[PDB]
C-alpha cells in the first residue's frame, strides 16, 4: 500500500549537524557548571545530580523545578546554551540544497529554546528551510510568568508522548504522512508509538522502532527514495 510523505519533522541537535561537532559534551559540561554555580557542589557531585535529574525528569531544568527550585528557563538556557561554541557548527551546503529540493513541509522539533535553535539554523545556513518550529517554549508556554509553586506547570520534553502530541497538534501533522528524524533512540521509539515513520540519524543500523537509519542526515536523499514520490494516495 502507498502512504505518501507530506511532512518531515527534524530534530535539531545532533541530527541537522553531526554529534561529533562536540556541542553535546559542551552542553553536559555547562549543565554541570550550572549546578556548581547554583549549589556550590563539586564538579563530580554536579555530574551525579545531572544524570539523576535527566533520568528521572527529562533534564536538569525539569528536575530542579520538580524538586521545588524556581529556576526560570531563561536563566538555565542562557547559561547552558549561551556559552556554547556556535562557531564550531559548520554550514552544510549539501543539506541546504537537499532541503530546498524537498517539496514537503519541514518542521523543527527540539527540546532546546528557540534562541539556541535559531542560532544553530543560522550557522547551518538553514534559517528559511522550515515552516514551523516546536521548541522548549512551545511545549512549556505557561512557564515564563509567575507560578503558584515551582512545578505548577511541569516541564514537557522529548521523549515524552506529551511532547510528541504538542508537536503533532501545533504543526497539524497527519502521522501517517509524516516522517520524523532524530538521533536519539528514545525519541524514535516515542515517535513510532504515535504513528510516525522514523529515521534514526547517527547510526547505519536500525533499532526496532526505526524505519530507516542513516549515519548522516543528507543520506536520506537516497535511503528514503519515497521522499521524491509524486503519488498522493
Ligand atoms: Mg538530537
Residue numbers in the entry: 2 to 234
Reported in the publication:
Here we show that Arabidopsis thaliana possesses a highly XMP-specific phosphatase (XMPP) which is conserved in vascular plants. We demonstrate that XMPP catalyzes the irreversible entry reaction of adenylate-derived nucleotides into purine nucleotide catabolism in vivo, whereas the guanylates enter catabolism via an unidentified GMP phosphatase and guanosine deaminase which are important to maintain purine nucleotide homeostasis. We extended the substrate survey for this enzyme to other mononucleotides and found that it is highly specific for XMP. The loop probably stabilizes the orientation of the cap domain. XMPP is a member of the Haloacid Dehalogenase (HAD) protein superfamily with unique characteristics since HAD enzymes typically have either a protruding loop or a cap structure, but not both, like XMPP.
To elucidate the molecular basis for this specificity, we determined the crystal structure of XMPP with and without XMP bound. Crystals could only be obtained for a shortened XMPP variant lacking 13 amino acids at the C-terminus (Met1 to Ser250). Consistent with the monomeric state of the enzyme in solution, crystalized XMPP is monomeric with a two-domain architecture. In the α/β-folded central domain with five repeating β-α units, the central parallel six-stranded β-sheet is flanked by five α-helices on both sides. A 20-residue-long loop (Pro142 to Ser161) protrudes from the β3–α8 unit, and a cap domain (Leu20 to Ser89) with a four α-helices bundle-like architecture is inserted in the β1–α5 unit. At the junction of the cap and the central domains, a Mg2+ ion coordinates six ligands within 2.1 Å in a square bi-pyramidal geometry involving Asp12 and Asp14. These aspartates are conserved and important for the catalytic activity of HAD enzymes. Mg2+-coordination by Asp12, Asp183, and Asp184 is linked to catalysis and is of critical importance since the respective mutants are inactive.
